[PDB]
Design a binder for this molecule. Structure first.
Ligand SMILES: [Zn+2]
Ligand SMILES: [Zn+2]
Ligand SMILES: [Zn+2]
Ligand SMILES: [Zn+2]
Lengths: 344, 351, 367, 460, 198, 284
């Protein structure tokens, strides 16, 4: 995505995986590696071990790191002792990380110099005008009947599927088409996501979207205005290219327990060089009101207000029922879709 | 420690009628970050304020608005005497964003074309709110300046944070040489007062020019309500005025009759003029220890006079700023108010 | 550039302005297509609009930046027709004849849209702007290379055409060495000098394309003292303060006041036949502009025959409106006809007064 | 607000005239009527003859006749006047006692009661015993709200609070806690608080030996102006004197010591009707002593402080450590959820913040204000006057804890044709009184203003 | 780089080239552009012909620069030999003479940007070594160069010059403080210094 | 919504005698004074304790009455203080009367009165930034003869008008005297959104006052009570003296001149005109 756009020529930066065998101990120039290959249980081959031996052999004067917090600092300290380098670098993503142990990776590498002040970045023009909202999808009888039925975690897709959520999504789609804006949707579901995509009848990103198809939809979404809504699932995120954020919609709110919300906020919200809309970065959390995840939607709201981004709630949708394709609008069809999701 | 004008030395003549053609500046420069929103937004806001003010104090003049985008001068309000049109035009502009480079030459030529119909007794003017540090001319400029001064068209410009040689030449040129009209600003408040002082008519020392009697007539309000009918906009309007001579209805205005084309006014416009012609002598600040006058106000009744011997406090001053001809005191608030809003000096009225 | 007769005869300009406003074209045709006014005087009223429009039109943009920029500030959009495509290319053409000539020569074949501009990138944007490409992509071929060769000596001859005998304050030439015949030293590597000459030449070409210019007293005091006493004489019985005294007087005061309240209240600060309303509005606009032309002319003055034609037309219009009122009374009845008469009373009175005034003036001139 | 005016009109007509016998009371209630009625009454007072209604309609132009209805309905409700279907017309005129008492008051009348004041050496200092009255008011406020130690000995006052159910506190256990009444006490700043207390004293002190005429005479004479000399000495009924002693106990009377003297006119009685400045061992800084902080970030910014005041603030926000200028507290959804546990509506707090804690938010409310009302038509975007972001957050919290939506009015019917229903709906949209409507059912539950105006148009 | 594109977007560029004729032509176009609207930049050489005689009045010069400090020994040892003669014949060391010459040319360049006292104009320099030479400069330049204006960064430089340009733009014409620094017609000199005959 | 009603009662003992001369001497200004006191009390009661102020205009100057500039250095009883203080001041003023007072009859300081009162309103409004005062002044004049229309005060009156409109201060006027519609005052009330009342002499105004001089504080939904039309056919020609309709106004002078141009040097500013322009005017 960048290093060839960057000046880097990958001819020297051999990529090692313990599965992707590459040129070690012969690279004339700099190398690009990964924590999994450098020191992890995922040493599927001795290519990683040979890379580490070469790393010990050459006094690597500098090290570039990206998102070391996920990987435990134990392997970092082990390779720090093993390689005996001259200097390092930490390109952190979170203020507080699990690798803040007694031996801090700061003094292992160096002091702080700059902080990723997202209020400074997402407002100067990169992702300027970040507005957040949590639309409360109206409750229906079937959803609360299911709530009373069970208290397990299966209710996630059960309150996710609300057809009124799709109605609000379609209104957002048509509004942003009218404004010529771009829409990103976070929907890790499969069956309900495909049902909504069929209902809207437009080209769409979905769960495990093909990479070529995903790139085509991204082109037709950020460039073409006939299609402007993409549904990003949980398959991509940290494995795909982050598209410009102008209008973000979130549906699922589990994302493990924590720090996944922060990572998603940092990544999904990417630079958007558009200023036509007064709020050039919409955040939406379509939440079925009076459901299990009301508590976690409030948790998301508190998280966001901690993040400092502008937040609101728009449940007084203008022309909420005036949108086209009022399929499954009735609570009877809401219950039928609930029966469908109970299979999921 | 005082900041006062020493004396007014043209209290004999002004241009009472006017036709001022304000020209804004909507070009890429105006998008820098020195004034709170930008240059541009603050500029247009103050422009609205100035439009209201100017059409108040000079309620018999006209005005036209001109922008400078993409090196072009695109008229955004015909020269007209109704403030609301210009106000709306500026409203519309403020939501639109600048581009291109300021083509001072084109704007100048468009103005000179625009002010041709203005008759001899009416006086012309332009007010360039120049914001950038360059121009982009499709022709000789000194040609235009020469044409201007040939057409007796005074020009005043309000540069932003710099001084441009050509603009200085421009102001020095049209205004009969006497250079005082290229005032540039150093603060927002300075900018507000800049527009404010742009509001008044403009004397320097007028050459002896033609002075001409102008025909005009006053209207009389109408009575009927259901008979709503208009001859200046062709609508139904519940009641208006009558040209004394053309004898046709005209929606409320100091406008020109749209039938027989003679100026219409009531008088209060003439009253504003009178206020501008012959102002008062600047009120003097009485000596601190030599006053020995009444301990109150005169127009008002304020208790802010002195303190009688207080080391440094009494050594400061004696708030007794007192006008000359009536030789009566007035507290600072009263003097500020008299010299700003109402110009009949209280005591000097009474004798 | 703008003259009264010029705008009068600018027929194409006038028709363009007709296209400008629906209201304008409407009023004009109904003043014309209704066997009404010759367009000449119709514009003679509207001249300032014409002048404004004309000036808003013929407004050549500057050369300068965009002209330059068209070589510097324009290095990214390798796609289709970029920003200000026609505008940028015309800026190029006025800026550089060679590209215009090459594009024209490469119209019948070799499209200059995509492939023309692609090869142009290499050829020109190496020729102008940055350093001598020399090696690398030498796509400067065919027309490109030909025009390169041309432009070389062309810029040469231009530069030749630029040399003034500069006034002897600045004359560095006569200043340097052309006083003496001396023997110095010099010690301060080809190419790029051409770059410097390029920027000089561009700037000077720009500037030159701009120099181109293309009882009293006694009893007074008595009564005063009397009152002063009365005051001082205790008195001031606010109880005795009238209250209203005569209930009748009170009543009368109330009567006066309610009368005035009623009259001033009568000031309530909606026609029936919307189609007839619009038609009458058209009639009013018509009669208004007609009278406008008279009250111009009848004041001003030797074009008496023009005034005569205007007066005859105005009398015709008055009779026309009389028939209009007759038809309105016939069809719409009375109440609607009454409303129409009310709506048209002011204009009707004005035109009638104008007719009477003309009759008086005509009698005065004749008798 | 119980809107004592409603209590005023509650009492019957004969006792109303009984009260109107006291000119000072007439004037004091003249102070209360809506301005329209004020002007109309002042008109009628002098011309000694009834007046037809038609004139009093034509006096008022459109866009405001709703105030005409307000005034006439109010005045008729309290029966200050007597409508007279004399000739089938409407011969308006006031209760003649009202007219004579008022006119006497304007021009040197015989209201010895209003003139009960005595002028003498008023050695009472401004701070002098004013601080004592302020301290008593603070003491009772803290005791009712419940302080760490509530020295409030108002046995009569405590009985009034309990039997009146002033606050949701277990007086049986001695609890003085915030109920709906307690929440209102937390809400009504001064005029509201003093008024609720006066009404409570009225309700409790209403059984025997009342002399309600003398009661209101005494109350308003307290509120009228500084009686000073001989007030407690002479200008009081026997039961009037007892009520005066009780009120002085309640703070609202700043009677001096010695138990026998002229009336001690504390500032509080002035505060009863003034609707003005609210400021009261010997230390009292002259400044907006109220201290708090409320801004877009939903946090407390307190540099100034006042103990019972900051406790009031805490009544809907957490406390961890009181500081020198600050107290540890951050206003969040849970902070107001604390009061939502008491079920207190997020309504009084709105205007409270807009008004109270402004002694520490003067500049905040000014920068929010920005005079963005004359500038509102020009610049269409208001500059966060009365911050609506926090308002939206508060409304969101209220709905989250609320889950129920209610509307005021009454069900309406007999909309026989769609034309009348549509015209009434358009009129209501013009006046903004229609909560919701539908021509299919010809029914809604809204205020009565549209029906009132249509009925008035039809009948007259 | 793209650096020249921006200055193109604002002002005009007029380089200095060895042939004198083209140089004169460029210089006069520079003047013609300055007195016209578009701002124009002329970049030349301190040792070069331009600094020698050409004058830069009010309009024609506002902000000279001195990219680096002019030194010669880039080239060969004729300066070395002359400097040898200098040291042996005069009690002058190498770097002393070199700095002296450099500041000579620097002052000659700088002085061009003023003509009267009504004129004005920034006179920046740019190099680390300049800071210690502050005394080598001519006096009247040194006076205006206060201590606090040393080794400023570019950013504070832009700030200060912005404030300057604004302030000078003001018509600060008390005309009574100008009786101090103008010695008006026939009198203030007469009075003042005929009394100063002391 | 508190209001600052600042009455401006002019008392010319010349005009007072005229009032005695008018009709019969069946009562001096005393009637007006008492009615004014009562009306002032009425307003003082109506609102939530909103201040007042009163100014006079005697033959040789003006002087405040109610606000009672520093001198030492019943019923609500504040009514008492206001009224007794006013009457003490007015009796003091009546002591200020003699032949030297009879001398300077040349002018009539009403314009000074209005101007100073407006200044007072500004003072009070400015000091009381909190609780903005919807103020509005009044005017009471004893309409006398001997001058059909004094005009040397024409301009300051209009300057008062413009100040009033900017300050948003309706100014109501009550003329008591002969049937001579005070044209300048009439335009003043009409333009500044006021009310004009040309009563007869001897009726106890109090009804007129409390009716039509009490609806201007901060209401304005209510039809004002102004007399017949307020024609704005303004000042007569400076040269002629006949009211003009199709005016002819010179120039920088601004004077309004009749159809009779003197041909040169409009007779208020020495400005000779283009005889070509004169002929152009004469082209009719
Ligand atoms: Zn109209
Ligand atoms: Zn006319
Ligand atoms: Zn004063
Ligand atoms: Zn004076």
């Amino acid at each position: 995505q960048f290093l060839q756009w960057c000046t880097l020529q990958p001819e020297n930066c051999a990529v090692f995986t313990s599965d992707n065998k590459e040129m070690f101990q012969t690279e004339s120039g700099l190398v690009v590696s990964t924590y999994s290959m450098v020191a992890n249980t995922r040493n599927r081959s001795h290519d990683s071990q040979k890379v580490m031996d070469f790393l010990t052999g050459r006094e690597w004067g500098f090290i570039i790191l990206d998102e070391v917090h996920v990987v435990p600092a134990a392997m970092f300290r082990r390779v720090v002792s093993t390689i005996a380098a001259h200097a390092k670098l930490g390109l952190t993503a979170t203020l507080v990380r699990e690798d803040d142990k007694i031996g801090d990776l700061n003094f292992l590498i160096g002091p702080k110099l700059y902080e990723a002040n997202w209020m400074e970045l997402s407002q100067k023009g990169h992702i300027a005008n970040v507005q957040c909202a949590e639309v409360w999808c109206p409750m229906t009888a079937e959803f609360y009947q299911e709530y009373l039925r069970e208290t397990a975690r299966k209710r996630m897709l059960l309150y996710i599927m609300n057809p009124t959520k799709f109605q609000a999504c379609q209104f957002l789609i048509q509004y942003h088409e009218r404004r010529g804006d771009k829409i990103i949707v976070f929907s890790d579901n499969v069956y309900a996501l495909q049902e909504y995509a069929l209902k809207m009848g437009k080209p769409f990103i979905y769960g495990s979207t093909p990479q070529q198809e995903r790139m085509n939809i991204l082109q037709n979404f950020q460039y073409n205005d006939q299609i402007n809504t993409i549904f990003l699932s949980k398959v991509g995120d940290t494995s795909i290219d982050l598209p410009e954020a102008t209008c973000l919609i979130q549906i699922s709110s589990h994302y493990g327990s924590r720090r996944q919300e922060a990572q998603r906020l940092g990544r999904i919200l990417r630079a958007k060089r558009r200023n036509d809309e007064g709020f050039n970065a919409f955040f939406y959390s379509l939440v079925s009101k009076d459901t299990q995840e009301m508590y976690y939607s409030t948790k998301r709201q508190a998280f966001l207000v901690d993040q400092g981004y502008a937040f609101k709630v728009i449940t007084h949708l203008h022309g909420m029922e005036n949108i086209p394709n009022l399929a499954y609008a009735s609570p009877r069809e809401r219950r039928e879709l609930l029966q469908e999701v109970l299979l999921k | 420690k005082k900041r006062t004008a020493k004396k007014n030395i043209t209290p004999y003549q002004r241009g009472i009628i006017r036709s001022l053609i304000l020209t804004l500046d909507c070009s890429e420069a105006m998008l820098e970050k020195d004034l709170r929103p930008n240059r541009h937004a603050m500029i247009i806001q103050y422009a609205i304020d100035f439009v209201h003010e100017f059409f108040d104090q000079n309620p018999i003049s006209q005005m036209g608005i001109i922008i400078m985008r993409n090196g072009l001068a695109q008229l955004v309000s015909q020269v007209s005497g109704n403030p609301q049109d210009h106000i709306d035009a500026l409203k519309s502009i403020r939501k639109q964003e600048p581009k291109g480079n300021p083509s001072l030459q084109n704007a100048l030529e468009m103005a000179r074309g625009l002010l041709l119909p203005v008759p001899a007794h009416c006086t012309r003017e332009v007010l360039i709110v120049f914001g950038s540090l360059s121009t982009t001319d499709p022709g000789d400029i000194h040609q235009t300046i020469d044409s201007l001064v040939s057409e007796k068209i005074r020009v005043k410009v309000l540069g932003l944070s710099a001084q441009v040689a050509i603009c200085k030449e421009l102001c020095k040129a049209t205004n009969y040489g006497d250079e005082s009209f290229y005032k540039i600003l150093l603060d927002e408040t300075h900018l507000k007062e800049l527009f404010n002082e742009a509001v008044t008519p403009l004397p320097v020392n007028k050459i002896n020019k033609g002075f001409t009697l102008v025909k005009m007539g006053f209207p009389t309000r109408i009575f009927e309500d259901t008979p709503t009918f208009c001859s200046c906009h062709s609508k139904l309007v519940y009641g208006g005025y009558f040209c004394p001579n053309c004898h046709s209805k005209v929606c409320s205005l100091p406008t020109v009759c749209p039938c027989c084309d003679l100026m219409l006014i009531l008088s209060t416009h003439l009253a504003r003029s009178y206020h501008h012609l012959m102002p008062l002598k600047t009120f003097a600040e009485v000596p601190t220890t030599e006053k020995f006058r009444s301990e109150d106000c005169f127009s008002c009744q304020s208790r802010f006079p002195i303190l009688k011997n207080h080391k440094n406090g009494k050594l400061l001053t004696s708030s007794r700023y007192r006008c000359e001809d009536c030789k009566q005191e007035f507290c600072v608030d009263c003097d500020v108010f008299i010299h700003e809003i109402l110009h009949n000096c209280p005591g000097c009225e009474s004798k | 550039s703008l003259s009264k007769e010029k705008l009068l005869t600018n027929l194409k300009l006038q028709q363009s302005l007709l296209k400008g406003n629906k209201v304008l074209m409407k009023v004009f045709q109904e003043t014309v297509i209704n066997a009404g006014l010759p367009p000449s005087e119709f514009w003679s009223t509207r001249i300032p609009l014409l002048r404004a429009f004309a000036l808003s039109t013929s407004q050549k943009v500057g050369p300068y930046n965009v002209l330059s920029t068209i070589k510097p500030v324009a290095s990214s959009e390798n796609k289709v027709n970029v920003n200000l495509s026609r505008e940028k290319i015309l800026n190029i053409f006025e800026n550089y004849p060679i590209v215009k000539k090459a594009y024209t020569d490469n119209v019948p074949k070799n499209f200059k849209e995509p492939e023309f501009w692609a090869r142009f990138f290499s050829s020109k944007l190496f020729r102008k702007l940055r350093g001598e490409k020399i090696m690398q992509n030498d796509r400067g071929d065919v027309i490109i290379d030909r025009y390169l060769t041309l432009d070389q000596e062309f810029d040469r001859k231009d530069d030749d055409m630029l040399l003034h005998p500069v006034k002897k304050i600045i004359d560095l030439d006569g200043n340097i060495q052309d006083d003496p015949v001396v023997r110095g030293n010099r010690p301060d590597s080809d190419g790029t000098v051409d770059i410097l000459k390029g920027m000089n030449r561009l700037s000077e070409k720009m500037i030159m394309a701009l120099k181109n210019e293309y009882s009293n007293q006694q009893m007074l005091q008595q009564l005063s003292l009397v009152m002063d006493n009365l005051i001082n004489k205790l008195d001031l019985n606010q109880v005795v303060p009238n209250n209203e005294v005569s209930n009748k007087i009170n009543k009368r005061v109330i009567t006066a006041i309610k009368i005035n309240a009623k009259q001033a209240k009568h000031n309530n600060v909606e026609v029936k036949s919307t189609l007839p309303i619009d038609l009458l509005e058209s009639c009013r606009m018509l009669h208004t502009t007609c009278c406008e032309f008279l009250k111009h002319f009848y004041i001003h003055q030797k074009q008496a025959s023009t005034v005569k034609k205007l007066y005859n037309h105005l009398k015709d219009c008055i009779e026309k409106l009389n028939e209009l009122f007759q038809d309105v009374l016939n069809g719409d009845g009375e109440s609607m006809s009454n409303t129409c008469t009310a709506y048209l009373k002011p204009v009707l009175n004005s035109i009638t007064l104008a007719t009477h005034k003309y009759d008086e003036y005509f009698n005065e001139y004749n008798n | 607000k119980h809107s004592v005016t409603q209590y005023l009109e509650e009492i019957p007509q004969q006792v109303q005239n009984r009260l109107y016998t006291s000119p000072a009371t007439c004037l004091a209630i003249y102070r209360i009527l809506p301005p329209l009625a004020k002007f109309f009454i002042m008109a009628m007072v002098f011309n000694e003859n009834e007046v037809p209604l038609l004139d009093l309609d034509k006096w008022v132009n459109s866009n405001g006749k709703l105030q005409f209805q307000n005034a006439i309905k109010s005045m008729k409700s309290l029966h200050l006047l007597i409508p007279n279907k004399s000739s089938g017309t409407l011969m308006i005129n006031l209760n003649p006692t009202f007219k004579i008492s008022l006119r006497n008051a304007l021009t040197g009348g015989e209201v010895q009661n209003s003139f009960g004041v005595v002028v003498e050496e008023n050695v009472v200092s401004l701070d002098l015993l004013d601080e004592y009255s302020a301290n008593k008011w603070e003491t009772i406020l803290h005791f009712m709200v419940g302080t760490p130690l509530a020295k409030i000995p108002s046995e009569k006052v405590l009985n009034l609070l309990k039997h009146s159910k002033l606050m949701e506190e277990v007086n049986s256990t001695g609890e003085f806690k915030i109920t709906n009444e307690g929440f209102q006490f937390l809400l009504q700043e001064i005029n509201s608080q003093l008024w609720t207390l006066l009404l409570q004293y009225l309700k409790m002190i209403e059984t025997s030996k009342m002399d309600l005429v003398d009661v209101l005479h005494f109350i308003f004479m307290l509120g009228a102006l500084e009686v000073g000399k001989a007030y407690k000495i002479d200008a009081l009924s026997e039961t009037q004197r007892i009520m005066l002693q009780d009120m002085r106990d309640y703070g609202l009377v700043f009677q001096k010591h010695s138990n026998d003297s002229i009336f001690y006119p504390t500032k509080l009685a002035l505060m009863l009707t003034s609707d003005t400045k609210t400021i009261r061992g010997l230390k009292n800084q002259d400044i907006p002593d109220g201290s708090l902080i409320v801004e877009t970030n939903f946090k407390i910014y307190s540099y100034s402080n006042s103990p019972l005041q900051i406790a009031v603030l805490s009544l809907f926000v957490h406390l961890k450590a009181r500081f020198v200028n600050m107290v540890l507290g951050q206003i969040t959804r849970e902070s107001i959820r604390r009061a939502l546990t008491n079920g207190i509506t997020a309504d009084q707090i709105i205007a409270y913040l807009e008004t109270h804690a402004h002694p520490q938010m003067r500049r905040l409310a000014e920068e929010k204000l920005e005079k963005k009302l004359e500038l509102d038509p020009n610049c269409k975007e208001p500059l966060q006057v009365l911050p609506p972001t926090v308002v939206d957050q508060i409304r969101l919290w209220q709905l989250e804890l609320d889950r129920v939506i209610t509307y005021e009015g009454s069900l309406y019917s007999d909309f026989e044709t769609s034309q009348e229903y549509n015209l009434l709906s358009k009129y209501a949209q013009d006046i903004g009184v229609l909560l919701w409507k539908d021509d299919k059912k010809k029914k809604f539950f809204i205020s009565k203003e549209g029906n009132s105006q249509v009925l008035d148009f039809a009948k007259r | 780089m793209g650096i020249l594109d921006e200055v193109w977007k604002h002002k005009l560029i007029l380089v200095e080239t060895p042939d004198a004729q083209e140089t004169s032509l460029a210089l006069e176009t520079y003047r013609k552009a300055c007195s016209n609207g578009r701002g124009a930049i002329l970049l030349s050489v301190a040792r070069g012909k331009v600094s020698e005689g050409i004058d830069f009045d009010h309009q024609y010069g506002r902000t000279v620069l001195m990219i680096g400090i002019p030194f010669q020994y880039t080239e060969s040892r004729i300066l070395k030999a002359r400097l040898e003669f200098m040291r042996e014949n005069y009690r002058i060391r190498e770097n002393d003479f070199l700095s002296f010459d450099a500041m000579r040319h620097a002052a000659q360049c700088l002085g061009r940007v003023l003509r009267g006292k009504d004129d004005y104009g920034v006179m920046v320099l740019a190099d680390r070594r300049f800071s210690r030479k502050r005394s080598q400069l001519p006096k009247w330049i040194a006076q205006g160069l206060s201590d606090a204006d040393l080794n400023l960064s570019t950013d504070m430089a832009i700030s200060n010059t912005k404030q300057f340009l604004r302030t000078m733009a003001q018509p600060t014409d008390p005309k009574d403080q100008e009786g101090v620094s103008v010695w008006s017609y026939e009198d203030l000199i007469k009075h003042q210094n005929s009394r100063k005959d002391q | 919504s508190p209001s600052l009603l600042t009455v401006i009662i002019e008392i010319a003992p010349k005009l007072w005698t005229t009032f005695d001369e008018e009709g019969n001497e069946k009562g001096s200004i005393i009637k007006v004074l008492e009615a004014l006191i009562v009306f002032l009390n009425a307003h003082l009661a109506f609102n939530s304790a909103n201040k007042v102020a009163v100014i006079a205009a005697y033959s040789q100057g003006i002087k405040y009455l109610y606000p009672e500039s520093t001198s030492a250095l019943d019923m609500y009883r504040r009514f008492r203080n206001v009224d007794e203080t006013l009457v003490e001041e007015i009796y003091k003023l009546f002591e200020l009367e003699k032949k030297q007072i009879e001398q300077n009859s040349q002018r009539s300081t009403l314009a000074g009165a209005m101007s100073a009162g407006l200044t007072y309103v500004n003072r009070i409004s400015k000091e009381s930034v909190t609780t903005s005062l919807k103020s509005r002044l009044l005017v009471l004049t004893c309409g006398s003869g001997s001058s059909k229309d004094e005009i040397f005060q024409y301009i300051p009156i209009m300057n008062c008008i413009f100040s009033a409109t900017k300050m948003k201060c309706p100014i109501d006027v009550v003329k008591i005297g002969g049937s001579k519609e005070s044209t300048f005052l009439q335009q003043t009330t009409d333009a500044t959104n006021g009310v004009y009342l040309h009563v007869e002499s001897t009726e106890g105004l109090i009804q007129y006052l409390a009716t039509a001089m009490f609806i201007d504080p901060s209401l304005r939904p209510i039809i004002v009570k102004p007399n017949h039309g307020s024609v704005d056919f303004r000042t007569s020609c400076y040269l002629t003296g006949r009211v003009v309709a199709v005016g002819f106004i010179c120039s920088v002078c601004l004077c309004v001149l009749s159809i009779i141009p003197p041909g040169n040097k409009c007779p208020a500013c020495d400005s000779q005109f283009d005889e070509h322009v004169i002929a152009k005017l004469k082209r009719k």
